[PDB]
Amino acid sequence: MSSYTAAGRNVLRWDLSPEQIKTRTEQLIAQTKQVYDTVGTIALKEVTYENCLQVLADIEVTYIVERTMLDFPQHVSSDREVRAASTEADKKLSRFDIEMSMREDVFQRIVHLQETCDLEKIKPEARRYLEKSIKMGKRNGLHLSEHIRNEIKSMKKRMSELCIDFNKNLNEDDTSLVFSKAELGALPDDFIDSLEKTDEDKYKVTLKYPHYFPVMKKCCVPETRRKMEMAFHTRCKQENTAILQQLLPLRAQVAKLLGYNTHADFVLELNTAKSTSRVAAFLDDLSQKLKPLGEAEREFILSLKKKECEERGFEYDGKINAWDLHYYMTQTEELKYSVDQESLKEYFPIEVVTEGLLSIYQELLGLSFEQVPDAHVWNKSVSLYTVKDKATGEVLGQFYLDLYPREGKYNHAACFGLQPGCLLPDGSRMMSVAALVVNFSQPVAGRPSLLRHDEVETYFHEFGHVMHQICAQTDFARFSGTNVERDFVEVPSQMLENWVWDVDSLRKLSKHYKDGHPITDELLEKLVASRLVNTGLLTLRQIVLSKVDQSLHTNATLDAASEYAKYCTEILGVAATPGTNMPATFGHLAGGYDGQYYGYLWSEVFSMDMFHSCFKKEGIMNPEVGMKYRNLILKPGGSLDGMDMLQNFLQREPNQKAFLMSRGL
Numbered sequence: 047m048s049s050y051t052a053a054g055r056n057v058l059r060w061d062l063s064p065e066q067i068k069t070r071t072e073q074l075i076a077q078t079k080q081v082y083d084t085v086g087t088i089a090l091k092e093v094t095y096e097n098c099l100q101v102l103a104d105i106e107v108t109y110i111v112e113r114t115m116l117d118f119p120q121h122v123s124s125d126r127e128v129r130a131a132s133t134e135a136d137k138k139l140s141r142f143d144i145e146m147s148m149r150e151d152v153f154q155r156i157v158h159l160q161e162t163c164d165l166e167k168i169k170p171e172a173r174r175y176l177e178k179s180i181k182m183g184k185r186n187g188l189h190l191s192e193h194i195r196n197e198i199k200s201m202k203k204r205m206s207e208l209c210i211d212f213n214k215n216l217n218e219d220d221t222s223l224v225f226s227k228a229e230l231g232a233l234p235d236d237f238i239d240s241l242e243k244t245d246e247d248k249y250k251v252t253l254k255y256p257h258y259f260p261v262m263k264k265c266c267v268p269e270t271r272r273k274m275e276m277a278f279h280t281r282c283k284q285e286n287t288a289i290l291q292q293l294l295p296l297r298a299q300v301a302k303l304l305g306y307n308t309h310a311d312f313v314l315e316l317n318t319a320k321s322t323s324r325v326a327a328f329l330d331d332l333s334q335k336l337k338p339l340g341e342a343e344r345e346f347i348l349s350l351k352k353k354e355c356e357e358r359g360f361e362y363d364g365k366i367n368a369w370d371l372h373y374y375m376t377q378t379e380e381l382k383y384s385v386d387q388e389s390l391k392e393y394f395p396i397e398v399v400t401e402g403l404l405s406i407y408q409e410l411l412g413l414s415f416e417q418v419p420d421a422h423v424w425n426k427s428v429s430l431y432t433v434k435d436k437a438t439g440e441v442l443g444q445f446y447l448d449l450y451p452r453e454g455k456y457n458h459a460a461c462f463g464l465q466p467g468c469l470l471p472d473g474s475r476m477m478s479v480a481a482l483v484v485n486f487s488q489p490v491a492g493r494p495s496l497l498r499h500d501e502v503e504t505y506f507h508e509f510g511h512v513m514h515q516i517c518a519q520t521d522f523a524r525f526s527g528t529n530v531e532r533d534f535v536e537v538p539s540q541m542l543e544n545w546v547w548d549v550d551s552l553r554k555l556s557k558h559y560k561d562g563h564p565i566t567d568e569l570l571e572k573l574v575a576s577r578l579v580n581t582g583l584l585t586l587r588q589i590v591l592s593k594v595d596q597s598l599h600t601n602a603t604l605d606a607a608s609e610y611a612k613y614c615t616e617i618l619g620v621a622a623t624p625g626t627n628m629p630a631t632f633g634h635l636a637g638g639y640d641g642q643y644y645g646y647l648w649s650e651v652f653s654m655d656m657f658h659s660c661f662k663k664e665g666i667m668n669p670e671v672g673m674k675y676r677n678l679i680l681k682p683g684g685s686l687d688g689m690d691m692l693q694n695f696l697q698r699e700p701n702q703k704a705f706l707m708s709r710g711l
């Protein structure tokens with residue numbers, strides 16, 4: 047199938063029944079294992095590029111594609127039965143994945159292939175394929191004695207359970223409090239009316255994010271904010287503190303058995319940050335550069351508290367408590383820019399944001415987006431688009447847009463890679479496929495869907511991931527799409543966010559939904575100028591969490607809560623509430639990417655360097671720079687190291703000057 051059409055290149059089924067999902071899973075696992083069994087039995091002396099590397103590579107592509115039809119419905123299907131089947135399928139397939147990665151026999155074949163192979167004869171990406179494959183095996187201990195390999199098993203096992211147990215507790219928790227209307231002063235009528243009422247003139251308030259934050263940010267009653275913050279940071283205190291006490295030491299031992307000093311170093315080796323000392327130097331120096339901004343903001347907030355405590359007859363303690371930060375930061379936003387979010391949204395009808403976003407990406411990346419007429423989708427609200435290179439007509443891929451909240455649908459924003467843009471056996475290329483999943487306000491009371499500014503920002507972010515997935519073209523499935531370093535994956539996304547804080551871009555994404563008049567220049571200038579409100583404390587807060595993260599995987603004998611409290615006073619200047627245990631509620635530790643929390647801030651520094659040093663310098667809609675970004679940063683996917691791609695694009699090593707300049711540091 048030609049690279050200049052979408053015909054027949056996307057046959058993913060989105061209407062499979064529970065029984066079919068179950069059957070296909072059984073068959074995919076069984077048939078895929080036969081392939082690894084075959085490679086695992088090749089006589090070492092007869093291992094070749096064709097019967098070993100090529101076979102492993104071909105099966106990796108086939109498996110990944112079939113697997114998406116089975117593990118994606120759990121996130122978008124309208125049928126609960128289908129979703130449950132998908133969840134089960136993902137669980138079996140995830141276990142199988144671990145099984146195959148622990149194959150000693152297959153590993154031996156790849157190691158011996160590299161020994162006798164003349165790397166200069168094959169392509170660079172293939173060398174990286176072997177290199178990375180052997181590296182992963184060693185990271186699983188496939189080069190060690192059976193005794194050590196087994197001990198590493200009964201350990202990677204527990205740490206998996208302990209993490210599911212940690213998460214389960216938090217998720218299951220149903221802690222609740224009851225406050226009177228008076229105790230919830232300053233909270234909007236809409237908020238209170240959404241609350242359950244008791245056999246008293248009391249309202250029920252849970253600790254889930256939808257209740258917790260509006261209260262910590264708007265409730266003028268300090269004592270209420272206080273109890274809410276205390277209950278929130280003591281959730282599963284015992285259960286999870288005990289889990290963390292077994293878990294962190296387990297991570298230490300496993301790292302040692304594998305030849306690493308700490309778990310942090312084990313984790314960091316696969317990231318562009320490379321090491322623990324580098325991450326520490328990154329964070330330490332950043333908090334130093336932010337110290338003066340944090341002091342000023344903290345000073346300003348403290349004066350607001352002292353002034354309010356007077357105007358309200360409230361007692362004063364001269365300090366910013368944990369349950370005070372959210373409130374006063376909100377006050378700061380209101381006093382310095384006062385942007386009526388609910389008013390501004392009227393200028394962002396989803397039709398307009400969508401057409402503008404696409405129009406902008408088309409021009410910048412030299413692409414054309416065309417909506418597929420009668421597309422096969424998982425829900426009628428989903429639209430499908432074909433992506434062609436404007437100049438050549440090449441069909442790079444297709445992307446789906448699933449924009450509204452729906453029962454059973456993933457409730458957070460994300461981009462799912464569904465098909466890799468890698469080479470197929472015949473040398474033809476597989477068409478890349480992505481799904482943009484977000485939950486934007488649906489139309490109500492006769493008004494179209496109206497997006498708040500932060501939603502437009504999320505839209506650009508997620509679309510940044512989609513372009514990465516679609517423009518990425520590699521020889522191997524494992525290096526395709528967004529398969530780059532974990533502390534590099536948010537580079538394409540955070541850089542695109544800058545466009546929603548650009549006056550002229552904003553002009554293309556807005557029009558009043560009613561009469562269609564534009565956003566006044568006065569409002570636009572106010573909007574962009576407001577971007578960095580509270581950055582000092584917000585950033586320092588993210589550094590503290592990043593430090594706690596590194597610490598929990600560097601020294602597994604220290605007390606989490608104490609480490610957290612230490613960094614709070616030293617870096618944020620806001621004390622952790624005595625008796626609470628934030629780390630015990632830090633879902634990021636157990637499941638997810640523990641040891642990688644610093645990645646988001648690390649990515650932002652990099653994206654800021656590319657945006658200011660290149661786009662700002664040449665004009666953010668300059669096609670030249672746009673194509674350079676697409677070709678040097680997106681197209682290579684994970685077939686090249688993150689730092690090398692940055693350097694190719696920048697023509698120099700990256701640095702944080704641009705990032706610091708933005709903050710006025």
Ligand SMILES: [Zn+2]
Nearest residue numbers: 507511536539
């Ligand atoms: Zn992202």
